[PDB]
Automatic annotation (TrEMBL), chains A, B, C:
Binding locations of ADP: 119, 146-152
Coverage span on the entire protein: 182 to 568 of 568
Organism: Geobacter metallireducens (strain ATCC 53774 / DSM 7210 / GS-15)
Name of the protein this chain belongs to: Type IV pilus biogenesis ATPase PilB
Residue sites binding Zn(2+) per the record: 277, 280, 312, 315
One of the record's GO molecular function terms: ATP binding
Domain Bacterial type II secretion system protein E per the UniProt entry, residue ranges: 203-217
Cellular component GO terms, alphabetical: cytoplasm; plasma membrane
Swiss-Prot/TrEMBL keywords: ATP-binding, Cytoplasm, Metal-binding, Nucleotide-binding, Zinc
Family stated for the protein in its record: Belongs to the GSP E family.
Length: 387, 387, 387
């Protein structure tokens, strides 16, 4: 009955066509609630009676951590039919006093679209990104938090590059989207297939462009560096606040700055914020000083028309519907490289990139605010200030 | 024999409407003190020789190990007093050289009052609080020291707001009563779940109603006020003297003024003062001007029949029996928002709330004096004059 | 002869009013030294055959391990030779290269006055100190070395606060005197009871007034600040050169100015300086300019009447006998608070404090010089000039 019970619990939430799934255990109750169009409904009460006797066994059956019931966890679930027309869930686990509560929010690979022109890049930034992904070598780091649009931007680059003249092979943990003509390896760390082993196999597979799901340790980073310096364009990912903090993250990991300065051609940082609801969007009164204090460049300010959804069902009573990406696309220009040779810190890199005209994710969010697709509060929710 | 005596001690604290029990060893003495209506009284001087065995006994009731008498310990005790009559205790024991000091904190909503009109909210304050907690988004802040009835007031607000349609998440320090259906996280710094990380998980847990235990740094504050503006109901606390001093805490840490002004609907501050004992209360010829100087309106002064209990056993020969809440309930009125955007200080905001009719906590207490419910000295003891 | 000699070593210290006894064996000598008013004098050169015998004898007096003579040992002795408290001694055995040196620390509360008005406070300073110990919350720091009457000042405050209405918790390493009603904790770090654990534990003990033995880091400093800010009266110590540099020290430590301004009510610094002996006291024609150089404002200069002891047996032929306390009391004035909030350093706080009437220990000593109880040179010896 335990095998059936675990199968029932996992299957029912998926089965009932819920827009958000809330699984909440308590001291005396254990409930499932569906958020449908911004509103929660209690949808199921599993029994308290079988919780403790068959505890560890089910936790092993659902491939969950049987020993940990105390800390938050965050992930992604991409479910494809083979390819990219994949329905996916953003999964968040939270430790309540009587067990872990999980919240699942639905999204799609294509509703958040893979056209690099549709990703929100400024013309210089879009130029640098397209120019960067079409180079024969170097490192491109797409940075941002979880749920920030990273997989779409990298895949947008892969689509831009997927041509019959080049051999594309990717190593992902896991593979988010399938591409015919691209040799995609999903990491199977258990059998020894991790990012390092897959990169080395790619390196034994006569590769031209190598994609690694993530730079996890300095050794894998170093192998990626090797692949980049031997003549391959290597693209990978880190979870950081912005592009320069990714620099400081690798420097803090122990990589010499000059390797950072030499191997990386472009670092982008990004985000997903909610787009104002087109049904209830209204212009919103926001003081000019708060927008200036939040990071907007002086020339875009007077033009801003900030919209806010009053909150309807298509925005989950949030006033926002869909997502918008806010980007800071900083190229590793040769002067910046010289600065590394002159020992500049990451903060100096940030100062110089702003000096070079690179708008931050905050300024790009304020740009989205300017076009009236997001609100200033969304800009503040998803990005940090440039001040 | 001694165990039974201990049971009597714990029953008597409840019977005497004590809020705290203190089992106190000294170098050469041992005494038991109850905090009754917020004030401690020496109630027992047990022999020092038996105290540690008694302490050892408490650990069995807490399912704690009697063997360890050398480390600080903290826990809970559930005692089954018959039927639904069960009693939770937050217990902290500390082993000094000459014995263990034990502190007991009663955990029973039965002892608590839950009707918000019965909490001490003035009709203006109750009205403004209800108006604040029933808005679809924004922040409501309840200030006062620990044990000032903040937990009772918030428990009443969440109960007002406790719907299946909302994802309610609370971060608490500590939990004083358990509600099924509310996602309650208790802080545990040793494993990494703090206010900032928990707040970000709440923003990722599809929240509707958010309660944050305490504000530690600027990061968590900015996240919470922006979560309020995003379309979440956010509750939190500060130890301030009034709502404006809480404001100024927020201003000095760096939250942009429009965020505070626009995401905060309302701020309450609240104290507890003892009620004049109904048995021994006698009119106290408190000069009416002293009442006015303390914050009584001029018209109500001569009407005041100020009472003080001369003292009887019902009030522990103190003249006071029970407590009452003094509330200053200041909604984040737009004029208050204009002041936030203009950088106003604590006194100006408090002055405007009073100008707008927000009774301060001192004035609320003197009104309680007018009703003969509390004495002038208790109002004076827990509130400062409005001056 | 060795037992009688040892008794002479312990008793002549009583007749000599010594603070410490040092019994030191050497290769070519053997001596007994008394500490009188902070200065050591040789009082006996007992026979070197008894070098180890006298010091080994004290172990026997201390109920210490005679079999071990190679390792440092520490114990306690209770001797009944008088005073106000028993002649208790803390014994420390050190195996030097020429025998065991034993040091005995004389313990007697009556060696210091516990009345606050007899601790040497000036009336305005005593008033501000009492006002400070009676506010419901905040932090007050008393700086000075141990034995400068700091613990007695604290104990005097505790006696003023030792009511059955307050929960008093102290963390001391160790507890010098015990007070009924005051919950005192001796630190025992071998079992996990350090200063940090005891503060956080007091905070779990429902405290009202909290005493801490020592501030050891920023982390503990933060817990302390928030305890003084969360409705507790917090008293603790550090040894710093003055109040303004203690300010700059904490600012350098990392505490936020607003928490500093909100939690600190008052900072005192205190030393015990030697009092000129009245018998050999003679007026000393100290030039007025030396006093102005020492720090008195020039308009007060001509009025100073400097005194000095010519030396007699009561003063060890030093001209001084006993101690008076030199206090410098900087209340956390609003002017001083505003200095905090603008990141002020030691110098401008010092300038403001002299502008605002904050007396230095040097100004208080010159006042005692004017009063003729201490001399200018002891002041110049143990204090540095202001002006």
């Amino acid at each position: 009955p335990v095998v059936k019970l675990v199968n029932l619990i996992l299957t029912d939430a998926i089965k009932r066509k819920a827009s958000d799934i809330h699984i909440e255990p308590y001291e005396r109750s254990f409930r499932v609630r569906y958020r449908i169009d911004g509103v929660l409904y209690e949808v199921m009460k599993p029994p308290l009676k079988l919780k403790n006797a068959i505890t560890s066994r089910i936790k092993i059956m659902a491939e969950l951590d049987i020993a940990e019931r105390r800390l938050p966890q965050d992930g992604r679930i991409k479910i494809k039919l083979g390819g990219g027309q994949d329905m996916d869930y953003r999964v968040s686990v939270l430790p309540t006093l009587f067990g872990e509560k999980v919240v699942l929010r639905l999204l799609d690979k294509s509703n958040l679209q893979l056209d690099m022109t549709k990703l929100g890049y400024e013309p210089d930034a879009l130029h640098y990104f397209k120019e960067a992904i079409h180079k024969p070598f170097g490192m491109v780091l797409v940075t941002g938090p979880t749920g920030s649009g990273k997989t779409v931007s990298l895949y947008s680059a892969l689509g831009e590059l997927n041509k019959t003249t080049e051999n594309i092979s990717t190593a992902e943990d896991p593979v988010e989207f399938n591409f015919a003509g691209i040799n995609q390896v999903q990491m199977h760390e258990d059998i020894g297939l991790n990012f390092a082993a897959a990169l080395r196999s790619f390196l034994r597979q006569d590769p031209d462009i190598i994609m690694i799901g993530e730079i996890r340790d300095f050794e894998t980073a170093e192998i990626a560096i090797k692949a980049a310096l031997t003549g391959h364009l290597v693209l990978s990912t880190l979870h950081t606040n912005d592009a320069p903090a990714t620099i400081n993250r690798l420097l803090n990991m122990g990589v010499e700055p000059f390797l950072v300065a030499s191997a990386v051609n472009l670092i982008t940082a990004q985000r997903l914020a909610r787009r104002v609801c087109s049904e209830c969007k209204q212009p919103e009164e926001i003081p000019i000083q708060a927008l200036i204090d939040a990071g907007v460049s002086p020339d875009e300010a007077p033009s801003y028309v900030c919209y806010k959804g009053t909150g309807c069902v298509k925005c989950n009573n949030t006033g926002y519907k869909g997502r918008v990406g806010f980007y800071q696309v900083m190229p590793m220009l040769e002067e910046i490289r010289e600065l590394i040779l002159n020992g500049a810190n990451t903060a100096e890199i940030k100062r110089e990139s702003m000096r070079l005209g690179i708008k931050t994710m905050r300024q790009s969010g304020l740009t989205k605010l300017k076009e009236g697709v997001t609100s200033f509060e969304e800009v503040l929710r998803v990005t940090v200030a440039d001040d």
